[PDB]
Amino acid sequence: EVQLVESGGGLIQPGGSLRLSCAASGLTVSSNYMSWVRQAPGKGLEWVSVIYSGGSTFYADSVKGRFTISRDNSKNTLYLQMNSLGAEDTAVYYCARGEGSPGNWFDPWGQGTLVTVSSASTKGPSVFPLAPSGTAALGCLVKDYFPEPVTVSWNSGALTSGVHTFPAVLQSSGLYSLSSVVTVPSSSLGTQTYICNVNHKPSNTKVDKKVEPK
Amino acid sequence: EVQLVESGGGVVQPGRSLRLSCAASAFTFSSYDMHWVRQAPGKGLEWVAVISYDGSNKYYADSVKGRFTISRDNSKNTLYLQMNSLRAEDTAVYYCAKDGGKLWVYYFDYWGQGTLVTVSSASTKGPSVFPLAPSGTAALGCLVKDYFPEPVTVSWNSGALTSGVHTFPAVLQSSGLYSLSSVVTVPSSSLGTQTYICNVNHKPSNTKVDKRVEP
Amino acid sequence: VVMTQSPGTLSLSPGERATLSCRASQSVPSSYLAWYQQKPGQAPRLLIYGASTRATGIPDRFSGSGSGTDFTLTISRLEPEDFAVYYCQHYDTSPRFGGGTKVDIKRTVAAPSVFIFPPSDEQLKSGTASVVCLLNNFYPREAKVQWKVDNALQSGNSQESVTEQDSKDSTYSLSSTLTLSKADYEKHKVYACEVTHQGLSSPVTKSFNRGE
Amino acid sequence: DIQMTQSPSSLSASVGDRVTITCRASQSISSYLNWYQQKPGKAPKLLIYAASSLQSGVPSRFSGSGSGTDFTLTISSLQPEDFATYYCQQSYSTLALTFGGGTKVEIKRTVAAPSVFIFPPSDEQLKSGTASVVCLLNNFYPREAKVQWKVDNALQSGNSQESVTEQDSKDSTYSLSSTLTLSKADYEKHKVYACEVTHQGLSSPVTKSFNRGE
Amino acid sequence: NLCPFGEVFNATRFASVYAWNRKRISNCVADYSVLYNSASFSTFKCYGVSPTKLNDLCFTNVYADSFVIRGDEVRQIAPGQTGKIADYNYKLPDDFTGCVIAWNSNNLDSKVGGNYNYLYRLFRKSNLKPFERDISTEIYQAGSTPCNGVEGFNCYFPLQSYGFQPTYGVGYQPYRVVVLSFELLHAPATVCGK
Ligand SMILES: *[C@@H]1O[C@H](CO)[C@@H](O)[C@H](O)[C@H]1NC(C)=O
Ligand SMILES: [Cl-]
């Protein structure tokens, strides 16, 4: 039951500050090596910062002087204060127990949280149905949202087989858009209710769309 | 009244060697630590090496270690710096420094006057001296042009004309050589009566030039 | 100590043996080398540590070895779910990661199932029409999607998106979205996307008529 | 390596003013901080050793204080001959002695207009092939002076090199020499050779000119 | 008679950094000039005192601490440093007065199959005080559940081996370190230089 649950990601303007959280269960933050590792979109993994159990802190040269790692023992939570953010700081940030040295490897990892450094504004999505006509196809269109990400599930997670949620495309307007589809037998179209669960965390927008034939 | 007199600087090609000296006087030389400190042109000070009072212990900065060697001859009251495998970054003014003996740690209480070491593969060229004829007082001078390397010592009337003399710092023109200007303002009355001669001396090329300056 | 992973991408059929290399400019001890696996949309996971020690719960088909300037990760009996990026990682004065190696999985040719979706009436009342064309479960990735509106080929008003290789059947899926204003949408009747793919002996066209 | 940071990098004060220079250390150096004065073209001179001890022979207007990471050099009453560059230097790491970047102290002074003179190229110079026209600005303050060359009332830029002497220890004035270098073929092509001077102490720009061969 | 620095510098075997040795040197005449010219050293750094000045100084006691660490960790044996070695194994104060001497000992402290006799402390709840020595081998509790001296998940053995091999890179090779401390009390000195 060892979990690292992250929060704090989202949109921030260039030169602004943000603080990430890494709430832990199954291990004690103040007793371990705790690190932050980031991953720019489409790029590799970059170690960012570590805090030792005894309090020492270390930082990568790319973030020295702008980031600050800390922890709260009573909340069993790791933090990362990020100041003076620019476009190179836009990345998915992971927390992990350990440092990557012998007997001290990165394990376990948090789920990650995306940070977007942009001058634009947060915008919630609109959800439209993709209605069907052997097997049939249906889906949901999640259009005009910023920033990333959105997550889509079907029937609250009870429907997973044959689901395809596409990577977001950046429209010419500067807003993102994606579609989530799922293939089903044509017979269950009238005797099975399909609902797509769209979640846009950066704006607290949760939409449940029932998709039916027309 | 503690004196440190250095010598041995000049032109050296990259990869060659050069040996600096520094003679001490008027203090117990064989009981003090001695240092070398250098300064690149237009840059800051950089500590180079240290040698113990008896010459048995020697310590160097990482930037010159295994490449420079410090030594001393206490019977001659002289400190030495042997510089081998000289790179272009070694171009600097080198100082010898006495260690003040009032602390547990090093500090430089008396410095030598410095000697310039230029690591370059060029040739030492002598200067060309041209007059600057004058025309409410007047001003006249001499133009030291096309020489290499630094420095050149310019005086007026063999050291008799002191007040009102301005010797400008040299400028490295696009030809790789140096150009220098030295002027002096005199009253406009004594122009055809008093004689003015600038004394240019270029030790690297062994060139001494005296030029008449008349309107 | 720069770590260099090679190759960049690896394309092997299921059941084959994968060989991922991690070279080092200077010698790195075995006990300082580890491997991480990252599946699409997921966090990295510890695979091997100490060059050769398999992490807890990791299948036996993953094994590592090597020392000094040459480390190797081996995936015996490659499976479709092994589609991921793999990073080596070491520690000298700070943690350093390799560039990563993508492991693509080859499979037989699969023709796409094509579906076309009209814009919902909910979206039309907002003043914009999105027409969506779906290419479902095909291989290889190469495909051509052409929009034809009243038999006129459309260009400049469509965007595509492709999924990663599916972790169970190793196929791709593609969506093409044609975007129009409500006004321009009501001026035309026949909306069609034409699909050409290696698994199809002739192009496949899916179309609807606005209103019907 | 202990890095020493000096602030400010440069300052301007007038005679009698109180001058304080700050030197910070990347880590605690106890009290082993020394101050040096270096005049232009001269060897450094020890002023203060061990943070606050006055070196013998140093005038009483110099003093120092501080400990740990923050140190100060104070000139109680600035004198004209105090124009120099002042370095701090830590001695806690005796086998890795490091200096600060140095602080250049300049003397503030009332306005002084420059005496402008112009010189034609000599006859021994035209025998060689080159031809240099030298213009002299003498005993002025401040340093900021604009020297403009005009040949037949045509602006010249890129054919000359300026040179300024350091502040005079007696009267705290500067001096400028501009050397208009050109070939002999470019010398007899024109006639007028002027030197224009724009300075804060001139109610109207002054020009000293001569005609070639007159 | 002379102070016995040779029993520290020329010892055939060195201690692990977590259990670093210390030799109290008293009632002798210290000859530092011969000591510092006795061998070749890859690291020679002094703090608060010059190496050449020790020949004139008197101390109540002189301490010579010795241990083995890996090459990339020698930078931590200095005032104001942090890291696994300075935090959990051997710590110098910020106002440290003394010298730090290090030399490569790959030919002495590496083995064909890996020398697993040199260890360092990897896990510890808090940082060491200056000149503290922690030789505990208690199972480190990384979580809420106590270990009861049994290794397992979140229950780590506190020490880690270096596994020195002679074919490693210099950053991973063993280095012998000697630290000379100079205790100046308000008591009659017993160690003066010559
Ligand atoms: C170690 O032994 C050598 C001879 O092999 C000797 O010269 C040296 O002085 C000894 N070291 C010390 C600290 O005495
Ligand atoms: Cl998204």
Residue numbers in the entry:
A (entry chain A): 1 to 133, 140 to 220
B (entry chain H): 1 to 135, 142 to 221
C (entry chain B): 2 to 213
D (entry chain L): 1 to 214
E (entry chain E): 334 to 527
Quoted from the paper:
S is a large type-1 transmembrane glycoprotein that assembles into homo-trimers (Walls et al., 2020), which decorate the outer surface of coronaviruses. S1 is responsible for target cell engagement, while S2 completes membrane fusion, allowing the viral RNA access to the host cell cytoplasm, where viral replication can begin. S1 contains an N-terminal domain (NTD) and receptor-binding domain (RBD). The RBD interacts with the cellular receptor angiotensin converting enzyme 2 (ACE2), which is expressed on diverse cell types, including cells in the upper and lower respiratory tracts, allowing SARS-CoV-2 to cause respiratory infection.
